[PDB]
Design a protein around this ligand. Structure first.
Ligand SMILES: C[C@@H](Cc1ccccc1)Nc1ncnc2c1ncn2[C@@H]1O[C@H]2COP(=O)(O)O[C@@H]2[C@H]1O
Ligand SMILES: C[C@H](Cc1ccccc1)Nc1ncnc2c1ncn2[C@@H]1O[C@H]2COP(=O)(O)O[C@@H]2[C@H]1O
Ligand SMILES: [Cl-]
Lengths: 215, 202
């Protein structure tokens, strides 16, 4: 489990199995808050972490899962955390500070490149998500967010995909950037069309082809 | 050692423990590359300006930024192999240096500290974007743009070498609203639009 998942984290890709001790967090734990000094990045081994940024008075930007890396901004560009990280399931994680990062990094520049590729990918994606917030209708952003979650945690379930996302309705709405009421009706409508099925903290996507067209 | 001056204040080089490569000339009005095509080159401007544009759904162009001397563009398709996320278009004659992935790899074997600066540069670009949720007016956004243009190329004669449509594309508002704001500002005595430049009052 751990070895299989960790190998896919960019900071470990290609690296053979080379005591930075893995930490455990309860569900609903704030790993760190927006604005705090930060000396540490984390790699998720298991569980989900939501990344949130407070509004003038909290909109979710993304859901981090197994293999993903969060909190690297303040290590790469020293500054306060640009958002909060909050576990939504129990999380088992491995973390490292600037010192260890640099140690691990001096070893290999290709790891440096993998890390760059993560930030570029986030930057590429940043444009698109931001353009959606300017240009895309609500129901369309819902379909879109569902598929974004589908590609990250989706698995094959008898010729369809099960996307177990672990989010409340409220957290889904905070991810889309719209009201819970509006987000629900869109979800509801997708359901009556039979493109998706809502089952607790998981959606069953029967027709991703359609949901894609709608996105 | 003029090229040496400009390059020295590029993000990639914050650190001085020379480094000339071999540059390229681009005419004004040149598409260095277009949104969507494959990239394998990043550029560091020595002289001239470049607009970075992305396609809006209504077929208009959102200009994301105006790069000038010392700035880098095109690095995203080196680090994350894929299509250009924007187009880059010279608005003046441009001198710049280029590297493809092989070149960048070799640089980084040469000066390993270049890896840290690149990580810092992109991380900083993420951090800034986060801080700028102001998309959530038009004369108030234009003034901001004018000021942002003032810091980068001001001397406060601001030779921005931009077009009015280009200015509105920078703003993300209609040429209408924008041309309006930029008449109300002139009238009131603040700025005075003279060509592809401008002069402020406050
Ligand atoms: C951060 C946003 C712009 C913005 C402006 C105001 C508020 C939120 C976001 N996007 C970019 N900003 C500055 N330079 C960029 C942006 N997206 C791509 N670039 C550069 O031009 C790209 C074209 O080819 P590439 O290989 O994809 O990478 C290039 C980037 O250097
Ligand atoms: C522009 C984009 C935010 C966004 C804007 C519009 C729609 C959807 C998302 N930025 C981010 N994208 C992916 N991961 C991020 C983003 N901002 C912060 N993180 C991660 O959480 C941060 C917490 O502290 P840190 O600043 O040390 O670095 C962490 C990043 O890993
Ligand atoms: Cl990612």
């Amino acid at each position: 489990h751990m070895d299989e998942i960790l190998a896919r984290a960019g900071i470990f890709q290609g690296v053979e199995p080379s005591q930075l001790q893995p930490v455990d967090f309860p569900r609903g734990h704030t790993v760190f808050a927006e604005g705090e000094p930060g000396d540490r990045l984390y790699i998720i081994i298991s569980g989900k972490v939501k990344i949130g940024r407070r509004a003038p008075d909290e909109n979710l930007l993304t859901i981090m899962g197994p293999s993903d890396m969060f909190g690297e901004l303040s290590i790469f560009d020293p500054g306060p955390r640009t958002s909060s990280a909050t576990t939504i399931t129990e999380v088992r994680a491995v973390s490292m500070d600037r010192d260890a990062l640099r140690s691990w990094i001096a070893d290999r520049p290709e790891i440096s490149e993998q890390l760059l590729r993560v930030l570029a990918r986030r930057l590429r994606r940043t444009n698109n998500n931001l353009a959606d917030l300017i240009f895309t209708d609500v129901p369309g952003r819902v379909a879109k967010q569902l598929l974004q979650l589908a590609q990250r945690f989706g698995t094959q379930e008898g010729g369809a995909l099960r996307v177990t996302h672990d989010l409340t309705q409220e957290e889904i709405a905070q991810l889309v950037g719209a009201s819970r009421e509006t987000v629900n009706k869109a979800l509801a409508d997708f359901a009556h069309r039979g493109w998706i099925r809502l089952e607790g903290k998981s959606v069953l996507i029967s027709d991703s082809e359609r949901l894609a067209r709608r996105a």
